[PDB]
Scaffold this active site. Sequence first.
Site: not given
Lengths: 298, 298
Positions: B105, B272
């Site tokens: 991320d 994610h």
Amino acid sequence: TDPLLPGFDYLTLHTSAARLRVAVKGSGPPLLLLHGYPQTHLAWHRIAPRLAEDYSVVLADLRGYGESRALDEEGADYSKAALARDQLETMGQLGFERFAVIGHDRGARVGYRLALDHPQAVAAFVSLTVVPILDNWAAVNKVFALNAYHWFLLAQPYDLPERLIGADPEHFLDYTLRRMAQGRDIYHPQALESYRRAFRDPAVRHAMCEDYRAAVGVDADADQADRDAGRRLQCPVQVLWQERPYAAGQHPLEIWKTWAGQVEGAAIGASHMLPEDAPDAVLEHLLGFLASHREALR
Amino acid sequence: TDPLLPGFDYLTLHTSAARLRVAVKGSGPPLLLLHGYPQTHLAWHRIAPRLAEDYSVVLADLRGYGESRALDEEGADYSKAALARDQLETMGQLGFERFAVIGHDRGARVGYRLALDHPQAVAAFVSLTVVPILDNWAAVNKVFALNAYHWFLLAQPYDLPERLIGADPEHFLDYTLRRMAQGRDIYHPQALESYRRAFRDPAVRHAMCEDYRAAVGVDADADQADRDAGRRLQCPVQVLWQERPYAAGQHPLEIWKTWAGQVEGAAIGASHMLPEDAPDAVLEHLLGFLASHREALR
């Protein structure tokens, strides 16, 4: 120093699915004026009095905005199609089965959906700044989403945006109005207090989120179905847009010509908040359009 | 029932522009692990201990996240390039001029920018879920902006998003973590308390908004300049991505091959939040990549 809406009669209409705040004045052919976000019918205060010299003018708060409320306090429909039915019922109650519709921002979205769903009821249609949501969604890119971030925030599932915008409602309201006006001093202080009081009501904030949710979902589905069917607006259309650059395929006059056979319009050198920012320019165009299509109003 | 980060030594590094929280363990070739939003270095708790059996492992809180803070408490630079310099200084202070970088991320965004700006310093690069921001921005459409609404909210000018997300920080934090995990029960309750405490700090929230602002602006400008110059990552690259459909031109392996000559990767069937959701799968891939490129680490 002029009063707000001199001579307008304030009514509360009890419709099948809503309690609607309406203000009326005038005689002659009927006009329904529909405000947008995050406002109320007072957004028309610089326009409606002039129109009421020559027309029957009806101003309404959209379902859930201002002083209008859904009767279903848990799970109401805030889609454009439902709000379009509200307009049918409102105008019918007042004595009108067929009428012109002038909308700004979310109100223009209600208006065009009304025209599509109920072509017999809509004599003429004026959009201030708006094109159909189908076309807006197709145009999403980086800049669009940054500029119109609220289209994405307010459409998030319940109750994310309600929690965020409800924390300090007046601050968010004031910030949003300034931004939409490009910092221009266009809000009458008393109209402003009305917008503020509505926005302080959690139900109003929720109804606004529901509007934005519907725009993503059912409203876009409805536009697509019309496109698929080849269904167009049947009345004369005028579009008044903000003077700014439009990408190829995105010009409001071009887009409306794909949705209607009878389209005209003009650029106005003001912010998005056309009713309050450029009332004299708007009136010049509206009056001329309505006069030119006086036969359509019959 | 396993402790968090057994045997990790917690340090506070004083760098030119920041006070950085670091945790270190191990010996051998160096690895720098960089967490993402809205987290801290504890996101690596299921991965870092295994790696430290065979490598020198350095975990850091990104500038402004967790316990790391900019020294400029008014107007610090939170661009990826500035945070990349933090990494140079961090690794240098610990004795390393050249090292592998594993990011998730926002940390992967710091990592690739480091690799581009300072190719001599980056022996190998692993991205968990991330492609360059230039490519992300080019892919914006309706669905992207609804799914990733926060990219648009958090990038609004100061102090709009700070006011909104700061109203009930823990609620927004918890909501966001659940959403990012697809509702999966992946957050160790104690790691969670750490993420919560950071997010309750207004400075942390502001630094997160600044990250998102930089992503729109200077970070994208930097990527474009590299693209213009034909500058690519010079080291082996591995990309580990979430198993989901990718539009044409959007597959992470395809995109990384436009940014680097030596690219491999794999899909992982998780959310994610790969570090916490699929640590064993991530480790299998990481260990194999690092072993296969042991010469590059020399």
